Amino acid sequence: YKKPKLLYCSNGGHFLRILPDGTVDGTRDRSDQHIQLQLSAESVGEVYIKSTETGQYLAMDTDGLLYGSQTPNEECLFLERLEENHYNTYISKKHAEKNWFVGLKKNGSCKRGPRTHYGQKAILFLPLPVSSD
Q1: Rg of the chain over CA atoms, in angstroms?
Q2: Which residues, listed in sequence order, are joined to residue 112 by a DSSP beta bridge?
Q3: Separation between Cα atoms, residue 51 and residue 65, nearest integer Å
Q4: Which residues lie within the region annotated Heparin-binding?
Q5: What is the DSSP pairing of strand 5-9 with strand 125-129?
């Protein structure tokens, strides 16, 4: 069943899910349906994080701390960098002008520009949707 993809971050075993507290952060849950974000690459170079039912109403602020619950504006848009061996990266297309990275802590907390760059390996993520196998 192809559908909204999952927020895989390098391994601390979490899944990034939205809460009404202004967050989409990782907790290990696939038991409910909070972890389903519809992630396409809609424009050239841009990937779009849109909510399915719970999938994320993200807003990038300051371009460092990216939090989302109520609305998904386009600030949610980030530029996708393709690493080899099929790993994906995100650039913060909000301040893309300054080359700042989108990096998330799924194993942590909502995503943190103070270390978005290779400070943390939480800047290494995979987009894994439910697949029709």
Answers
A1: 13
A2: 65
A3: 19
A4: 105-121
A5: antiparallel
Amino acid at 26: G
Residue with tokens 């848009």: 77
Q: What torsion, rounded to 10 degrees, do the Cα atoms 26, 13, 36, 108 define? A: 10
Structural domain count, the chain: 1
* Cα distance between residue 31 and residue 114, in whole Å: 32
The three-state DSSP-derived secondary structure of the chain is CCCCEEEEECCCCCEEEEECCCEEEEECCCCCCCCCEEEEEEECCEEEEEECCCCCCEEEECCCEEEECCCCCCCCCEEEEEECCCEEEEECCCCHHHCCEECCECCCECCEHHHCCCCCHHHCEEEEECCCC
CA distance 93 to 98: 9
> Domain of 131: which CATH number?
2.80.10.50
Q: 88 among the known binding-site residues?
A: no
Tokens of 52: 């399915």
107: number of Cβ within 10 Å: 20
